[PDB]
Every structure is written in structure tokens, then in C-alpha cells.
Amino acid sequence: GSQVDAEGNPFWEISDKRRVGISQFKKMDFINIREYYEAGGEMKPGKKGIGLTVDQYTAFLKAIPAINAELRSRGHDITD
Amino acid sequence: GSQVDAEGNPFWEISDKRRVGISQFKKMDFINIREYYEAGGEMKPGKKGIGLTVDQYTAFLKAIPAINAELRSRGHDITD
Numbered sequence: 001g002s003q004v005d006a007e008g009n010p011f012w013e014i015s016d017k018r019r020v021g022i023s024q025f026k027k028m029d030f031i032n033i034r035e036y037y038e039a040g041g042e043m044k045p046g047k048k049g050i051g052l053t054v055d056q057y058t059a060f061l062k063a064i065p066a067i068n069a070e071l072r073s074r075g076h077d078i079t080d
Numbered sequence: 081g082s083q084v085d086a087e088g089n090p091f092w093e094i095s096d097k098r099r100v101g102i103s104q105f106k107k108m109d110f111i112n113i114r115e116y117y118e119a120g121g122e123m124k125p126g127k128k129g130i131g132l133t134v135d136q137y138t139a140f141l142k143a144i145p146a147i148n149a150e151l152r153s154r155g156h157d158i159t160d
Contacts, residue, residue, distance in 0.1 A: 002146055010150055012143035014136045020143055022150055029154050033113060033130055049130050050113055054156050056094045063092035063100055066082055070090055070102055074109050076134050
């Protein structure tokens with residue numbers, strides 16, 4: 001499910017500490033994939049991550065079938 | 081299209097400097113999304129990026145329809 005982070009941006013958890021979220025800067029949207037760390041009980045964005053532009057994200061989407069096929073070859077069950 | 085990088089791992093370009101590739105360490109596979117920099121004509125992996133486990137990557141896949149819907153709301157054309 002989608003949540004709203006401390007900055008008021010939507011995000012999805014992909015593990016206990018890693019998020020994918022969407023931020024907006026100067027009217028441009030970014031897809032942020034990033035690991036958060038916990039300090040004093042607060043989750044804070046850390047250095048492991050990347051903010052994709054929409055065009056980079058859509059290029060990633062186009063590569064996903066090939067990425068998935070490679071992972072299936074390596075023995076991983078991946079959905080269509 | 082899929083290429084093979086200097087380390088002998090498959091990768092896909094998502095922009096001029098950013099790649100998604102798959103590496104293997106101790107028999108575990110990682111999906112690496114990372115920006116490369118150019119020095120002396122050589123492309124080198126930089127600090128902007130993240131190496132997802134397969135489970136993190138599949139969780140990301142499950143979130144993509146919702147991420148896409150949010151981006152469409154924001155005005156971006158995104159394919160199914």
C-alpha cells in the first residue's frame with residue numbers, strides 16, 4: 001500500500017528500510033529508490049539510493065521484461 | 081538491448097550515464113541501479129545508486145502499477 005512520508009510525499013516500502021517514493025522539485029517529478037536508516041526512532045533518508053527522472057524510470061520499465069528473463073534464467077521466480 | 085559491462089555482468093542503459101544491471105555475489109543476485117561517471121574515457125560506477133536484492137526488486141515490481149498511477153495523475157504518459 002501507498003503511504004505519505006514525513007515530507008508529505010507518497011511512498012511504497014520494498015523492504016524494512018528501503019522505499020520507492022515520488023518527490024517533486026521545480027515541477028519535475030522523481031522516482032526515488034532509497035534506503036532509510038533509523039536514528040532516535042526516526043527514519044531518515046540515507047546515502048544508498050537514486051532519484052530517477054521520469055524518462056529514466058520509463059526506460060527502466062521498458063527493460064524490466066529483459067531483466068526479469070535474466071533473473072528467471074538465474075533461478076528466480078518472477079511474475080509477468 | 082542488453083550489454084555486458086567491464087566486469088562481465090549484463091546491463092541495460094536507462095540514460096546516458098545510468099544503468100540497471102545484475103551482479104552476483106556469494107551466489108546471490110542483485111539488481112543494481114546506478115549512475116556511472118566518465119574519467120579518462122572510462123565509465124566507472126559512482127555513488128548515486130542502489131543494489132536491490134531480488135526480494136526488494138520483486139516488491140518494487142508489485143508497487144509499479146501504483147507508482148505508475150501516481151505518475152499518470154501528475155501528467156506523465158506511462159505504459160501499462
